[PDB]
Design a protein around this ligand. Structure first.
Ligand SMILES: COc1cncc(-c2cn([C@H](C)n3ccc(N4CCC[C@@H](NCC5CCC5)C4)cc3=O)nn2)c1
Lengths: 211, 246
């Protein structure tokens, strides 16, 4: 299949995600509460724990980006949500000449060359192409705070043509086979009839309020 | 452009394409002048009582032989987690634990916390396959991806470099970790009492006490060792001038 891009502008805390159905792959890039003042809004540890990730899949894979103490909190969440962690992808950040971008943060011992993405599994995933890709990504840091587009290709080779959902995605992330959720998206674009029906009946006035 | 696609197409790992795999030398020199003589002890770490290793260590490097290192006796995470590492760590101290690429990334963190540390860095050893494209291995059956790296977790208890080492993948059955881990550790200037558990004849190094089952020889004496750190040298970082004596 190749279903075109769909998205929902929302607060992910408040959306009833049971209307979306089940997905072969979930990816999340959460604004973790990295104990620090930040220019963007974060989710508390409790809000992250409370996300209704368990409703989104029966059998399949979770990709969870983690940094700092979220390396531990993310593992907690992953387990809490019913996943076992079975891989860890790192993205080695380079410039246009394949040289590592090396940033240092106070309170840290080492410069950081990489970002980590935990890979979890739930249930009995069957018909996935394990072992086509390897667990290191080498790719160019484009915009600040973006993930590399390579992850989408890795996921598509792993699970071609299946339905996928991204949480905390940006507009540039929208893509065929994916539904993207986040609060910087532009309204709502849904095409899957099943999803369109369930959304209309859950949200007849089109409004996604604090429940 | 897309090195993941390129790996699928050719079997060359993306890291093969990373390029470039001060008085940092003056500081290497001060480390060398500070370093204790190499000390080492053959010991069966399962049967041996860890508390005999004194004094308490500033740094512990722990390299248990995981079965995953041997594809073509090993320590399990059960065995490792039961080591009494908190009994020999100084109240302010660091640990570097080689955790492999599998369930160790989780269990090694449980270990660190069990021993009283918090994980503060994750150092990845990324392995290139420039001399052997393709030529892949039987996935651990839970693996989703080809595993091409190993992690060394850094932990701290109490109150320069990047977190990547890139080398060519060693030949099968070669169990050694990159010597660069030592350079990273020593450059932190954390103290001069440095223990390497499950070291080997081949890893013995100035500035370190090496303890392991396969050592052919020993020179370790607890009193002699302790005398290297007696006043006025008790609190040296290992990156400063020796203190003048007469
Ligand atoms: C707060 O309540 C919210 C409730 N419901 C939705 C949102 C929300 C927020 N967003 C935007 C796009 N967003 C996404 C990620 C993010 N972060 C922190 C910055 C770094 C990112 N990770 C970079 C690593 C990955 C590889 C490199 C993760 C910050 C952020 O604003 N969309 N929806 C927020």
């Amino acid at each position: 299949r190749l279903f075109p891009p769909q998205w929902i502008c929302c607060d992910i805390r408040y959306l009833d995600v049971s209307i979306l159905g089940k997905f072969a792959v979930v990816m999340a890039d959460p604004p973790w509460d990295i104990h620090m003042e930040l220019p963007y809004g974060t989710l508390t540890d409790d809000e992250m724990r409370r996300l209704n990730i368990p409703v989104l899949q029966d059998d399949g894979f979770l990709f969870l980006w983690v940094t700092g103490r979220a390396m531990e909190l993310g593992r907690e969440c992953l387990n809490l949500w019913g996943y076992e962690r079975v891989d860890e992808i790192i993205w080695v950040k380079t410039n246009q000449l394949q040289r590592i971008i090396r940033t240092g943060r106070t309170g840290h011992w080492l410069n950081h060359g990489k970002e980590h993405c935990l890979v979890g599994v739930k249930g009995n995933p069957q018909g996935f192409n394990q072992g086509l890709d390897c667990d290191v990504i080498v790719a160019e840091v484009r915009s600040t705070s973006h993930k590399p587009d390579e992850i989408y290709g890795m996921i598509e080779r792993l699970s071609p043509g299946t339905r996928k959902i991204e949480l905390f995605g940006r507009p540039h992330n929208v893509q065929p086979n994916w539904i993207t959720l986040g609060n910087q998206l532009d309204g709502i674009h849904l095409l899957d009839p099943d999803v369109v029906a369930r959304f209309k009946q859950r949200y007849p006035d089109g409004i996604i309020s604090k429940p | 452009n897309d090195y993941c696609q390129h790996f699928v197409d050719t079997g060359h790992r993306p890291q093969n394409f990373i390029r470039d795999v001060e008085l940092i030398r003056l500081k290497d020199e001060l480390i060398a002048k500070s370093n204790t003589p190499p000390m080492y002890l053959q010991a069966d770490i399962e049967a041996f009582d860890i508390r005999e290793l004194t004094p308490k260590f500033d740094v512990i490097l722990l390299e248990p032989p995981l079965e995953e290192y041997y594809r073509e006796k090993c320590w399990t995470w059960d065995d490792i987690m039961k080591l009494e590492i908190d009994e020999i760590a100084a109240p302010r101290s660091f640990i570097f634990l080689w955790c492999g690429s599998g369930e160790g990334l989780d269990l090694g963190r449980v270990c660190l916390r069990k021993w009283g540390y918090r994980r503060c860095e994750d150092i990845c050893w990324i392995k290139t396959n420039k001399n052997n494209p393709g030529k892949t291995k039987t996935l651990d059956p839970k693996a989703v991806f080809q595993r091409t790296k190993e992690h060394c977790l850094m932990g701290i208890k109490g109150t320069v470099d990047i977190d990547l080492i890139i080398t060519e993948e060693p030949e099968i059955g070669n169990i050694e970790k990159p010597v660069e881990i030592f350079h990273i550790i020593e450059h932190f200037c954390l103290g001069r009492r440095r223990l390497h558990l499950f070291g080997r004849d081949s890893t013995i190094r100035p500035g370190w006490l090496t303890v392991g089952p396969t050592l052919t020889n020993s020179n370790y004496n607890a009193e002699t060792y302790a005398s290297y750190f007696s006043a006025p040298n008790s609190y040296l970082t290992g990156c400063t001038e020796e203190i003048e004596r007469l």
